[PDB]
């Protein structure tokens, strides 16, 4: 799994070493950006389901096209079941900021979803259209913290680069 | 990474030939069991003594039981295997 | 090769839950003490190279005929490669105290560990000896009780950590039996 | 034996988590999962392919070798596996010369280079009795992939000290390059073929382009030849009290 | 080079990442560990020939058989090379502490040092005699803080593990 | 490679010198302001897959006979591979920018790259300019200055960092040329 | 080049062998097909701007929302370079006639195809929009033979199915 | 490889001849005086760890520039490199005396060593004077003309054996120069 803790001890292993004062240093980084990024997961945790609300049935706002028949979404059981995987990434988000890295995004929700996006005729463009309407909407010095926005957004960013 | 603990593709030959002495063991098993019983019941009208039920459909009962009772047999300590080797070999 | 934090994440995929305030009551006790476990990390790192040599020496003067001929601790190749062997012991247990989760010690060093011993003819009655006696020169390490070698700490209570890598020492002690 | 670059200035090679894996009775290996998992499987694609950069439609035919690697964990069966790919063949088999070709299997396979033209005639003896496999398996099966891999690490480009030919590490820094280099950019032709066969070696600017940094890359040229002249006898005497002696 | 910076990006170069939200934080514990290295390094700065004028003579005050024909400091410019090669230690040791890892003790002090100085008779005991002098002669309100003789006093006996 | 720490060691050796009290003003003042290089290699790498993709396809708009048949990046192929190196370089740069120092980017980026795109018929000259296009959204996201994607940051200047990175994009795009 | 004759030769050159008689007998199917194939090689080289004006539009008839501002085809310029792409499918889908076999389609056509529309966010399901329209406007009587339409309806598969 | 023996068969090779009775007469005295071949060969191998680093050291003792900021025997790392290669060379030149033949000297230790060293800055002219220490300790102890270590032989001439192995250390000088 990718965390901060996980670098600095498979980088000592890997040379058969100690670990040493710089790998404690590390770890003192972990300590520094926890009271910002587990606290943007206490948020995203019991308002979780207002923020998913409010994302895809603004991913249909600039994707119409979406609810005719050929397309994806052109019975209720899919759109309940697109309601599904982005509940499925908003608790894959929450994760990552528990554990500091990327590892519940990139081996859970990242790896293969290139493939099953490709021959499940699905589009990858409307998820982007649709956890970007979760940064913007997202404001600072109302809902959160100031560095719990940047840590927010930087996970929310991640894997925008990598559906795109 | 020395010192030959560290192999390959005899690796694969060895979870490959001790299932050959032992699958082909248990075709010894399975018909030197059924060797004693071409004498019990010898011929198609079966014996008083081959009963498994009497009663209630409690073969099933049994089946729930002997299953279970030679799966208490190899679930034995190392001790115990060894004493089940070399004075079994001594009564045959 | 998970961590503490990783831990508490895979208790929770089983269920899909959104981690939200009743599991992080334990990862805010892991960050009031990570200075505290920092420091403690520290002291078996730096007292590193004396705390096999002493082991394995010990094991020895406790019992003598692991140097007869016939011994496994016989020639100068056996007796470099016991030394390597506990140098790597100490190494993987120092990984896991500072990770706060025995899963970097239990897959890259005791999968498989108790069957090259028997392979190899290693006594695991002397082994359990000498994981054991550095177990408790751990203790000592952390909690300031050491003889000598009194090192420099802040003052508070490190009794819970160090039996937590008294648990470690016991994960080794179970899997090399 | 000591080696002052190789785990000093270049990176520590790259594998699976141990060899006693193979013995346990429960598992295989130390389960790596499938974080640190393909970002093995990102340095064997580095490494076996050269930079090659092969593509997602070109990554779709070695699936099948993948997916047994992520369960036999051995990494002599996913190179063995993947050298015999038609990935692997038409990009250095197809357009190139018959000691390229050679000369490749010694950089992808056992990061040296080839010694000698008796080592590399036998190497176009097995190609004589069963084509480019009996190369690749050859290799592969060999005592000195087992005694410096094994079924444990990537096959990498190892800084020895104790080369048995100083000539050896020489061909090695001409076939390693330097980062961001790849094997398609001289058009099929080998760059140690003059040098095998003749017995010569290498341009000095060639190989200090490849070594690693903090190694003083190119210092040391006088402004004179680069090589030896074999025909040369030279007079080199000793100060002895009297006069001064040239044993020759 | 072992840092913290030179090792997260080395461990980002062999996955083919980028400069992950893991290893943002772990520049964010150099920042806060540096105040105390920092300071233990300015320190030996200004004071680096009375701490090597006291750890030379403590070999040769504990081993008094060096100066026999055919040892180690047998004539005047063996003493000289002994306090050189002692004022270059404690120099590797004032580098590893501005750039936080041990990356200048191992790549200039340590890799080599078994096969040099068994090779020279060079004794091992006594570079260790003279480093642990030094180590137990930090006080730790007078000398330096109470943190920094901690990052001070791990190079040490780092160096002190690594040569014995 | 060596960080902005290293190179002051490595200067400081070649005068066998202690690292004094006159070169930790500057490195005092690296980790002064050393929040806004994290908190700017940030604002690289979350836009760094529509930087790539904008690079290019301005490439396209000013010498259009790249995708003619005879042309570079044609076909298939040769646009996705185009489009990678786009990537490595983007990433070599942002190491760099994290590191303080430009040794990271020469030894692993830029030896022999001139090399051997004269001997696979890559024209450098339009090459360049792909480096430059994102050379310049590089600087006005560190600037804050762009028309979409306003990130919100703290207030004060990286006119300094904007210029770092202008220098790591000048150095490949000398060392093409 | 993957057709029949260059198939059987690079085999016979991986295995150090002269070409034998399972080679000739292979040849001897490049002699009784290729009169068919070139049926269809004849009608495509003189009707193609016929096609690719008629193929084009029909997935525009099919997703008319790629002419909305933020999409791909938002101005006319880049209907002009849709009309081109498919013109170099259908270049390509001649030239694989001619050789008989997959070959110039994959590596000059299909290498590359998921990294090049992702991120420029060309819909990859909106290409097959044009060529499952053209697959049923082959017409089996009047276009070509019926051997003829047998070998074009099985490379217009090959692209879809390897689109997807 | 060759030795005394193939160098003279390959010679007979070139004119198809037969190794007869007026070749045999050098072959017939390299077996004769074949016990001092081996009994000089042990009188250099019985010394080669005190040889080497003496030769070494006192190629430092004329040059002190290669142990200051910038030599090539700086650190550690760069000084057991050094010690590490005029033990190859010794023991290279002890094989091409026993062999009798400076053939293995020359294809194996010494064809491409010219390239390395100016690929990895290592200074010949130095280089050339470790070697040449220890071609001049090398004929002291053959001839037991040494100042410490009298060794005991039978007595007679080696006087031919001193001058054989000293035109093998020159090979090594003109092939690095
Ligand atoms: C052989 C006759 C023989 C031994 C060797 C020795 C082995 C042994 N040692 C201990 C106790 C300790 N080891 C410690 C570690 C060190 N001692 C030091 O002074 C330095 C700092 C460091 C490395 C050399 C320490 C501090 C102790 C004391 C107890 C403690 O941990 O504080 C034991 C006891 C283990 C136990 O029974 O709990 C043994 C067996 N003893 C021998 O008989
Ligand atoms: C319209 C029906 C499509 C659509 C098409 C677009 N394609 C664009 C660019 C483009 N197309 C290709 C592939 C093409 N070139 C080749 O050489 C070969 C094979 C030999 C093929 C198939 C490439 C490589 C490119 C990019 C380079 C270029 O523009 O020349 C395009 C313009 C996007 C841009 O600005 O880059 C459009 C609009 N888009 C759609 O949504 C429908 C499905
Ligand atoms: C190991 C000590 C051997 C041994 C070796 C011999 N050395 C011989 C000659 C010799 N040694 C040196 C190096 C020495 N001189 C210096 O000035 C310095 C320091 C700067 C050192 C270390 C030199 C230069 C020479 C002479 C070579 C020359 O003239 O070019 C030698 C030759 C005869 C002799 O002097 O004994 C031998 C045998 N001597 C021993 O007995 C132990 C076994
Ligand atoms: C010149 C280097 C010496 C010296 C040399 C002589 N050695 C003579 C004979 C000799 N040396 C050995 C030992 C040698 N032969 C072996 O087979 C082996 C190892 C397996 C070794 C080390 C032997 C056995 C002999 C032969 C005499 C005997 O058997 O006792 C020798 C006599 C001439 C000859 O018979 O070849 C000479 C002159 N003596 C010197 O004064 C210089 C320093
Ligand atoms: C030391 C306190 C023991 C003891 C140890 C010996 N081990 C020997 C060989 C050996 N040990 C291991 C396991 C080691 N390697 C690892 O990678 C890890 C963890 C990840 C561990 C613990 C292996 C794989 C091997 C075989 C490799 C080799 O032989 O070098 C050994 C030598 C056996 C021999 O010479 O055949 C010894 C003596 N023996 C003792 O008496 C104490 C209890
Ligand atoms: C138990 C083992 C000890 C003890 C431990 C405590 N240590 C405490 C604080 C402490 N330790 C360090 C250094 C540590 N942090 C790092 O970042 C690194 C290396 C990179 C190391 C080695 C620091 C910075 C601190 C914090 C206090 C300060 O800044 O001065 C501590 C205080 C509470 C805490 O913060 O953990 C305790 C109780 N004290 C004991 O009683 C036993 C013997
Ligand atoms: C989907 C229909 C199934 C399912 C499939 C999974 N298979 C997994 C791994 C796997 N599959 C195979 C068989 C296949 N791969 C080959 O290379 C060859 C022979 C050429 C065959 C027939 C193998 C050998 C493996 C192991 C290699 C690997 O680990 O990928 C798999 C992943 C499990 C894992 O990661 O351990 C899945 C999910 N599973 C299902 O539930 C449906 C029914
Ligand atoms: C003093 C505590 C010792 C002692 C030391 C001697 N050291 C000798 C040489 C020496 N020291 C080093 C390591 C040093 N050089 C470096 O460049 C660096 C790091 C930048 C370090 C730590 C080396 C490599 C050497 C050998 C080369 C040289 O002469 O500089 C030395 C002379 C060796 C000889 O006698 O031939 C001595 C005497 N002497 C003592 O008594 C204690 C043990
Ligand atoms: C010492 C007398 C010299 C000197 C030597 C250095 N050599 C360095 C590296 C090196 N040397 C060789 C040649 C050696 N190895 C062989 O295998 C054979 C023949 C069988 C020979 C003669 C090689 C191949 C290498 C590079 C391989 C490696 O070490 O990994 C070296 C290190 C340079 C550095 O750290 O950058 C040194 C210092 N240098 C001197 O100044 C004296 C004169
Ligand atoms: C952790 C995830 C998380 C988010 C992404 C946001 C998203 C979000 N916004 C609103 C709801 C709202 N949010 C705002 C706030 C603002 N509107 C603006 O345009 C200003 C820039 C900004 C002030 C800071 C306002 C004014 C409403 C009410 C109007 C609306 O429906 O958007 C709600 C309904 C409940 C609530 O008000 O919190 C949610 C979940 N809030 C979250 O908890
Ligand atoms: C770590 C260092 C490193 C890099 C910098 C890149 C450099 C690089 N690029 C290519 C390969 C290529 N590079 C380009 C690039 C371009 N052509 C253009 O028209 C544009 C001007 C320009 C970028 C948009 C193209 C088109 C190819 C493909 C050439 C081919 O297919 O043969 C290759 C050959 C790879 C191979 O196929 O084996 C290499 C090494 N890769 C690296 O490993
Ligand atoms: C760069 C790092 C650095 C160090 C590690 C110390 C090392 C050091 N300590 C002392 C010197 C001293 N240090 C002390 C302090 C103490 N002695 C004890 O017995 C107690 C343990 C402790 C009190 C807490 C005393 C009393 C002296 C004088 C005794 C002496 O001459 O060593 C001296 C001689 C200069 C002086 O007298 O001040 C030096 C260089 N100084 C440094 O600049
Ligand atoms: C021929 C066709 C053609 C194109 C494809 C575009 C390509 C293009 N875009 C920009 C220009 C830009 N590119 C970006 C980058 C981005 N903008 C965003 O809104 C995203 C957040 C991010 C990724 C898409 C920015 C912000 C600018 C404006 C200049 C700047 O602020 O840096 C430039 C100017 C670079 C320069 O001056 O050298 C060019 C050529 N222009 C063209 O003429
Ligand atoms: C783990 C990831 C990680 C990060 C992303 C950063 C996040 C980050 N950035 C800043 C802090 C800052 N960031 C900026 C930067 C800017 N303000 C502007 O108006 C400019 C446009 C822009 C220049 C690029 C400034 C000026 C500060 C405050 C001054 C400073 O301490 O540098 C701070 C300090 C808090 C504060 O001072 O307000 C933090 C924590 N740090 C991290 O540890």
Redesign the interface.
């Known amino acids: 799994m990718k965390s901060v803790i996980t670098t600095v001890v498979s980088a000592a292993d890997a040379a058969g070493r100690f670990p040493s004062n710089s790998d404690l240093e590390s770890i003192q980084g972990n300590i520094q950006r926890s009271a910002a990024r587990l606290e943007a997961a206490e948020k995203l945790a019991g308002n979780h389901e207002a923020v998913v609300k409010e994302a895809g049935d603004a991913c249909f706002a600039k994707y119409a096209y979406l609810k005719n028949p050929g397309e994806a979404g052109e019975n209720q059981e899919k759109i309940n079941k697109c309601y599904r995987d982005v509940d499925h990434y908003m608790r894959l988000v929450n994760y990552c900021l528990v554990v500091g890295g990327t590892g519940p995004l990139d081996e859970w929700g990242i790896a293969g979803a290139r493939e099953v996006y490709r021959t499940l005729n699905l589009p990858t463009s409307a998820y982007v259209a649709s956890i970007a309407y979760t940064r913007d909407r997202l404001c600072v010095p109302r809902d959160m913290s100031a560095q719990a926005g940047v840590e927010f957004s930087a996970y929310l960013d991640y894997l925008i680069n990598a559906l795109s | 990474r020395r010192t030959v603990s560290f192999n390959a593709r005899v690796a694969r030959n060895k979870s490959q030939a001790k299932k050959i002495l032992e699958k082909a063991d248990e075709f010894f098993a399975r018909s030197v069991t059924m060797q004693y019983k071409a004498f019990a019941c010898p011929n198609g009208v079966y014996d008083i003594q081959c009963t498994e039920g009497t009663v209630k459909g409690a073969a099933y009962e049994k089946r729930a039981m002997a299953v279970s009772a030679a799966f208490r047999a190899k679930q034995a300590s190392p001790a115990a295997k060894a004493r089940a080797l070399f004075e079994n070999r001594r009564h045959a | 090769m998970l961590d503490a934090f990783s831990r508490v994440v895979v208790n929770s995929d089983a269920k899909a839950a959104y981690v939200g305030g009743s599991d992080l009551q334990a990862l805010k006790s892991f960050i009031a003490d990570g200075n505290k476990r920092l420091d403690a990390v520290n002291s078996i790192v730096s007292n590193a190279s004396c705390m096999v040599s002493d082991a394995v020496s010990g094991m020895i003067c406790e019992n003598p005929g692991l140097i007869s001929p016939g011994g496994n601790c016989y020639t100068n190749r056996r007796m470099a490669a016991c030394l390597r062997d506990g140098e790597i012991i100490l190494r993987y247990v120092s990984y896991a105290l500072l990770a706060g989760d025995a899963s970097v010690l239990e897959d890259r060093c005791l999968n498989g560990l108790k069957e090259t011993y028997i392979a190899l003819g290693v006594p695991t009655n002397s082994s359990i000896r000498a994981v054991s006696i550095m177990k408790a020169q751990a203790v000592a390490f952390i909690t300031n009780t050491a003889t000598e070698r009194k090192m420099s700490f802040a003052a508070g209570d490190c009794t819970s950590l160090a039996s937590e890598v008294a648990s470690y020492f016991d994960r080794v002690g179970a899997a090399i039996s | ?4 670059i190789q ?3 270049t ?4 594998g699976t ?9 429960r ?1 295989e ?8 998992m ?2 093995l499987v ?2 064997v694609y580095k490494q076996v392919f050269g930079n090659a ?1 092969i ?4 990554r779709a035919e070695l699936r099948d070798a993948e997916s047994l690697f992520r369960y ?1 964990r ?1 990494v ?2 996913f190179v063995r596996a993947l050298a015999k790919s038609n990935a692997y ?1 038409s990009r250095f ?2 357009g190139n010369q018959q000691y390229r070709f050679f000369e490749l299997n010694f950089k992808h396979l056992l990061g040296r280079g080839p010694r000698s033209l008796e080592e590399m005639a036998s190497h176009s003896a097995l ?2 009795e ?3 496999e009996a190369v690749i398996d050859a290799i592969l099966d060999s005592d000195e992939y087992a ?1 410096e891999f ?4 990537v096959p990498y480009c190892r800084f020895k ?2 080369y ?4 050896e ?2 061909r090695m ?1 001409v076939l390693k ?6 094997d ?3 058009k099929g032709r080998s760059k140690l073929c003059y040098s095998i066969a003749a ?1 010569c ?4 600017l060639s ?3 490849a ?1 690693p ?1 903090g ?8 402004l004179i030849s ?3 002249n074999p025909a ?3 007079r ?1 005497g ?1 100060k002895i009290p009297g006069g001064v002696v040239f ?2």
């Open positions: 034996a000591f080696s002052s785990n000093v200035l990176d520590a090679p790259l988590p141990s060899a006693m894996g193979f013995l346990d009775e598992t290996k130390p389960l790596m999962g499938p974080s640190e393909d970002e990102y340095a950069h593509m997602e439609s070109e036999l051995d002599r069966e063949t088999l197809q190609y004589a069963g084509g480019f005694q094994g079924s444990t690490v000290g104790e048995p030919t100083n000539e590490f020489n820094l390059g330097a980062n961001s280099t790849s398609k950019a001289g017995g070696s290498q341009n000095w190989m200090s382009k070594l940094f190694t003083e890359k190119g210092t040391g040229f006088n680069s090589s030896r040369a006898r030279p080199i000793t044993s020759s």
